[PDB]
Amino acid sequence: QGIPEGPAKPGFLYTIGLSNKGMPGLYRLELQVTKGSGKLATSGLWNSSSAKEQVKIAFDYFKANASRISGGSKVMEHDFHLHVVELQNTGPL
Amino acid sequence: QLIPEGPAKPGFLYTIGLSNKGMPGLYRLELQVTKGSGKLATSGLWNSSSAKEQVKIAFDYFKANASRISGGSKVMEHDFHLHVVELQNTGPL
């Protein structure tokens, strides 16, 4: 274990950023969306306070701009589970 | 050959409003939907510019919020005609 050709499943993407040691690293973000109450679960974030804070900030902003992006989809009626996979052993992002 | 019992066809509704004289009156709004380029036509509104502006505002709001209400129907691919049927001769609304 830790980018294939073709589209992945919805909610799945790849990212690149400087790790805590300053070395660039590649990571995979996978999101599972189910019928829920607007709750968010986090996994694979290296159990880092900074990464969890970033994810909370992103979720709050997404909830704030639901109308612009969703165009009618009610975020509060669904729950999200976001998981992080390290692909190059570079360190936490 | 005012509101018959049983479900009317899609695009037909009833409204009540104070006419240009301020007296209450009932109006049947009739919508004809055809395959087209999103154009809007109107008739029977008793030649009032205010009614045309109201209908234009409503259709523009329909354009903006198609995703929230229609949930997948494309307004641009259908032309609409709105007709006003005054059933009480109360005056233009």
UniProtKB/TrEMBL annotation, chain A:
Highest taxon listed in the record's lineage: Bacteria
Name of the protein in question: Protease Lon-related BREX system protein BrxL
Species, as recorded: Acinetobacter sp. NEB 394
Encoding gene (name): brxL
